[PDB]
Amino acid sequence: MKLSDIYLELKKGYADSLLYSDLSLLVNIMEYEKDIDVMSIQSLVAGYEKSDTPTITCGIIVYNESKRIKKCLNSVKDDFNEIIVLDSYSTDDTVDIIKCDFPDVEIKYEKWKNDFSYARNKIIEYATSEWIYFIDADNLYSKENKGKIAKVARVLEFFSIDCVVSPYIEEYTGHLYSDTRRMFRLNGKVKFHGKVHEEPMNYNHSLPFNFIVNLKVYHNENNIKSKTRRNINLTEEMLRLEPENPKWLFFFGRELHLLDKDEEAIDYLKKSINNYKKFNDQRHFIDALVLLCTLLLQRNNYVDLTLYLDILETEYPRCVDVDYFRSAILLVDMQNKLTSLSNMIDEALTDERYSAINTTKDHFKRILISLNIQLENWERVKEISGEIKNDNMKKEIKQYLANSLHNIEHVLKGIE
């Protein structure tokens, strides 16, 4: 059997049950290709209510998080049995904000070596439970996960599936990450690797299966500039060890972008993309393509965007962002068609050629306003709008300029 099959058989067969109820916190089930050996589907829902419920501990590593450690721990101090904060010798409060308001949370210490894995890996060895789940301090643990976490541990042990576990992280942007690898069995197998952009690897160097489970965490400045300068130092390091690695070329390339060094980021993204072709962990391959495409787009480099676009479209055909960059290009072509039309109208007006409608060629000025407003070309519309030579056209334009003046401050009203 495949876990996929087991879930189906449990749908019409045993949707009554608890094994079912708790197996539906697993999003990711049709991805699990390993045989789960079973000899009776009936004995299984029955043996699941007899199953042990495991212990989860919650590891947080903090530096100067005076601003956000309170809301963080509040989200989380009721959902675990043991919470371990790992102070890297904060210069501000943090430590004592924790000590009075949160009496039950262990506080430990560790000087910062420039290694998120070493820190993270301390809390692993300090931790007493039999699963761990990591959460960072600017993050917040949805009210919705109440009583759900250990249910996820329980099923995965009940089938004894080896995996790390990703909840959904929702960016403050609303962007929703699902390769987060934040929870895993505390059983000697599996330890963080990497000075930065670290993730749990099962220690034969690995790459464990990832259950996306149905748990959620939410956000809680222009200190992005701060954090990024910190990480690029670490990323460039990790990359100099493996200078041809597509993941590291992309990671570095990305942070270069974040430090607006876009021309240099495009080079690393172009190299990352060449190297993913024949390379096994293709997880961030898409992230390189859609970033190189936006940067190429932002530099009005349509030929190279089209080339990379065809790659994104053949390598990931069900990615909607292909349709995004194609739209963006048509809309560019339309701008030029508008401009070219604005330009033959000017060429027309400057002949000897007479008008039978309005000898003042003043109806042409209706189209040219219309057409340069559309092009956002207020420079040239303000102009054209003086060259008008008649009251009742002027009378016509100002009354139409107002009804859109007031349609704007109507939509501008009800956003913020």
Ligand X SMILES: O=c1ccn([C@@H]2O[C@H](COP(=O)(O)OP(=O)(O)O[C@H]3O[C@H](CO)[C@@H](O)[C@H](O)[C@H]3O)[C@@H](O)[C@H]2O)c(=O)[nH]1
For ligand X, the binding residues in 34-63 under the rule CB under 6 A are 61-63
Is 66 exposed, middle or buried, given 0-12, 13-18 or 19+ CB atoms closer than 10 A?
middle
> Does 231 contact ligand X by CB under 6 A?
yes
Which among its own copies, ligand X, none contacts residue 307 (Cβ within 5 to 8 A by kind)? none
Comparing CB distances to ligand X, the nearer of 31 and 101 is 101
Per partner kind, with CB cut-offs from 5 to 8 A, the member of ligand X, its own copies, none near residue 137 is: ligand X
Q: Which of 39, 241, 303, 415 binds its own copies (CB under 8 A)?
A: 415
Q: Which stretch binds its own copies (CB under 8 A): 69-77, 93-101, 228-236, 351-359?
A: 351-359
Nearer to ligand X, 26 or 137 (CB): 137
Take residue 86 and report the two structure tokens written for it. 């790992």
Pairing of strands 199-201, 56-62: unpaired
CA atoms of 330 and 314, how far apart (whole Å): 20
Give the interface size with ligand X as a residue count (CB under 6 A).
Answer: 16
Residue 385 structure tokens: 């709008």
* Chain centroid to CA 348: 51
Pick what 348 binds: its own copies, ligand X, none; C-beta below 5 to 8 Å, kind-dependent.
its own copies
Which tokens go with 289? 């393509």
The interface partner of residue 136, options being ligand X, its own copies, none and the CB cut-off 5 to 8 Å by kind, is ligand X
Q: Between residue 191 and residue 230, which ones bind ligand X under the rule CB under 6 A? A: 196-198, 227
CB under 5 to 8 A by kind: which of ligand X, its own copies, none does 331 bind? its own copies
Element (H, E) at 392: helix 391-411
**Restricting to residues 327-386, which ones interact with ligand X according to CB under 6 A?**
none
Cα 202 to the chain's mean position, in Å?
25
The number of residues in the chain equals 416
Q: Looking at beta carbons only, is 144 or 242 nearer to its own copies? A: 144
Choices 12-20, 64-72, 92-100, 346-354 (CB under 8 A): range interacting with its own copies: 346-354
- Among 61, 83, 290, 295, interactor with its own copies by CB under 8 A: 290
Distance of CA 151 to the CA centre of its chain: 26
Residue 168 phi, psi (nearest 5): -80, 125
β partners of residue 109: 87
What is the x/- site pattern for its own copies, positions 292-311, by CB under 8 A? --x-----------------
- Answer whether 88's CB lies under 8 Å from 61's CB: yes
Residues 157-186 that bind its own copies (CB under 8 A): 172-176
Nearer Cβ to ligand X, position 26 or 61? Answer: 61
How far is 199 from 251, CA to CA, in rounded Å?
Answer: 14
Using CB under 6 A as the binding rule, the residues of this chain from 73 to 132 that contact ligand X are 88, 112, 116, 119
Rounded distance between C-alpha atoms, residue 194 and residue 114, angstroms: 10
Given ligand X, its own copies, none, residue 376, with its beta carbon under 5 to 8 Å by kind, binds its own copies
Pick 205 or 353: Cβ nearer ligand X: 205
Identify residues 138-167 at the interface with ligand X (CB under 6 A): 138
- Are 187 and 131 in contact by the 8 Å Cβ rule? The answer is no
Handedness of CA 111, 113, 116, 118 (dihedral sign): negative
User: Which residues in 163-192 contact ligand X (CB under 6 A)?
Assistant: none
d(CA 103, CA 73): 11
Nearer to ligand X, 230 or 410 (CB): 230
**Residue carrying structure tokens 């539906």:** 24
d(CA 65, CA 293): 36
φ and ψ at 306, to 5 degrees?
-65, -40
404 sits near its own copies (criterion: CB under 8 A): yes
Q: Which entry of ligand X, its own copies, none binds 196, CB below 5 to 8 A by partner kind?
A: ligand X
How far apart are the C-alpha atoms of 263 and 258, rounded to whole Å?
12
CB of 189 vs ligand X, minimal distance in Å: 21
Q: Could you list the residues that contact ligand X (CB under 6 A)?
A: 61-63, 65, 88, 112, 116, 119, 136-138, 196-198, 227, 231
